[PDB]
Amino acid sequence: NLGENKHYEVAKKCVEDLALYLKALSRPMQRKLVTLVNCQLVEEEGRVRAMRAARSLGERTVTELILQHQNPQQLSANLWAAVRARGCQFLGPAMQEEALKLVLLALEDGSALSRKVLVLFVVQRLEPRFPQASKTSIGHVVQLLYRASCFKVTKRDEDSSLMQLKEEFRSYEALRREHDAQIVHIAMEAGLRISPEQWSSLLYGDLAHKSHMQSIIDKLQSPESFAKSVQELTIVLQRTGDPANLNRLRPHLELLANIDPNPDAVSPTWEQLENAMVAVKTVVHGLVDFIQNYS
Amino acid sequence: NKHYEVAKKCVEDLALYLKPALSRPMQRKLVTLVNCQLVEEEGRVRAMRAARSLGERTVTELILQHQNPQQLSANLWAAVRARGCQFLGPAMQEEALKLVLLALEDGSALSRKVLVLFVVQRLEPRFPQASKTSIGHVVQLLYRASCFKVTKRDEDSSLMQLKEEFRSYEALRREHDAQIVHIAMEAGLRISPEQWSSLLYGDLAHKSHMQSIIDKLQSPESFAKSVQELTIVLQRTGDPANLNRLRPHLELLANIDPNPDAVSPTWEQLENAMVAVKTVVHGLVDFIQNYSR
RNA sequence: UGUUCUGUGAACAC
RNA sequence: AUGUUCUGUGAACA
RNA sequence: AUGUUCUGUGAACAC
RNA sequence: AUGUUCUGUGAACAC
Ligand SMILES: [Cl-]
């Protein structure tokens, strides 16, 4: 009858089908499934929540798919290879700390030095505590900060450019954060997904910087991250061959990535609700099919 | 330093409440205290002000716990009536106050009886319930608010002029609104700007106006007055949990200088303040869990 | 469940 | 600028 | 991997 | 609750 809405029924059935996975999947997937299942599709507010819950479920699916294709043994080596490919370097937790402190010693006050003068400033003062220090190794550290936009660079006609630390990076805490963020950026760009615990170990040699690294990771997320993660997965699958044809999920993940995650977003049409619930249904089914058959 | 260690431990003990219950303002003020670096003199100064701030809010939270939200309106109007005052509704009060201005705008001096009749006569057509009694209660509200310059006469009715500063509607209504807020405060009632807008105007379009009034009544004396106000609430309720035990702690916290250019604390003063605020916030949590209402 | 990170606008006071 | 109140989301790890 | 040059969101060399 | 008296930062009465 005309009192029955066909879009509503497909949406409802998709959610019911997904709810069967609760009674396996990861804890984050379970939590996000529960959130979707609790959305009341008879209300406009619950329909808005269902759209965001579907997006959230989908973004988590892509993350888990990428992690399944990622070699944990080779993770550190790939990071440092990616860092070196940009002319950058990490000299170890102790030596990097000291190096960045020596950069602050030079530029805290707003002085403008040349790259050559800045490198030597650091190498000289660093050599006693760390004899391996060199113009090359310290040049790579300065390049890391350059790539991070830490410097205001002033060109001079037919001469070496002068470099000042920007006002916002003239403390150790601010400078080290941006430095850490830049290494995270390089990892992201190379399609590496590294946990806060792993990052703390890599950059500080302890597990006492999880929260600091977690803060940096979360500040680099945007609403474009879901769409970029799908493109990333495509690159991973092209590299691996794609036995399970996870490429079939592409237009579903794209649709989910195009959902507005803001809470003050325009509420969905009935067609949009059905399409989102079918998309997320297919995507979560694809993940479970992969775990069981193509592990 | 034994004083430093007690202070540090008190703050650590309080930091446990950030994990699970307390209100968002209590959480914000706990965070501020926890972030104070007690190894520095500047952080020790901040810790004293944060402890005071956290204590003043605890008194607010204690008062709110003795507050049934369903009975909040009835308790307000009961408190208003207890002072011989009255609120006749948003429409009728507006009209009444405008009629008071019609009489006294120019600086005329009328007797209370003449002023009441002036209003009742002109108000009766639009509002038939108007009376000498009901309008007398409104005039009393303005009297209690110090809106009138009163001139005594030997063996005769006193004359009353509106003070210069209240000879416009906006100024007179503000002071009128402030006086009802005052009465609520004195009866140990804590009402939000949104609730006040609804009570006094019948809409939510006067939040800011009421918020302005509330914030202007906020001074460094407020903390000490709020403690006396809680005492009145507890005397009315009987005080099963013996929240009166917190009185000298709240008094100590109320006596802290809230100015940023205040003399920095001694180690003894730091310990005492951290122990006082610890006991006070613990008293709030003990009350919520064991003596809920 | 625990341990963390992260996120919006609107008013008012000086 | 600084403060106060109200209001607003998701995410990571075991 | 390491080093050297250079005004580099990075280039070019050496071993 | 409401009303009446009154020079009330509020008193005293009635019902
Ligand atoms: Cl239907």
Explain the overall architecture:
2 copies of one chain form a homodimer. Chain A is mainly α and 295 residues long. The first copy, chain A, has 3 domains: 1-71 and 223-295, no CATH class; 72-88 and 171-222, no CATH class; 89-170, no CATH class. The first copy, chain A, is 63% helix and 5% strand. Chain A has 13 helices and 3 strands; from the N terminus they run H-H-H-H-H-E-H-H-E-E-H-H-H-H-H-H. The first copy, chain A, has helices spanning 6-19, 27-37, 44-68, 75-85, 93-107, 115-126, 135-147, 172-189, 196-204, 210-220, 225-240, 250-257, 270-293, and strands at 113-114, 151-156, 159-165. In chain A, strand 2 and strand 3 form a beta hairpin. Chain A starts with 5 loop residues before the first helix and ends with a helix. The structure holds chloride ion. Chloride ion is lined by residues 4-5, 8 of chain A. The structure holds 4 RNA strands.
Strand content of chain A: 5-15%
List the total number of helices of chain A.
13
Helix content of chain A: 55-70%
Radius of gyration of chain A: 24 Å
Q: What small-molecule ligands were found?
A: chloride ion
Subunit structure (chain B): Interacts with EDC4. Interacts with CCR4-NOT deadenylase complex. Interacts with MAP3K5; the interaction is probably stimulus-dependent.
Protein name (chain B): Roquin-2
Subcellular location (chain B): Cytoplasm, P-body
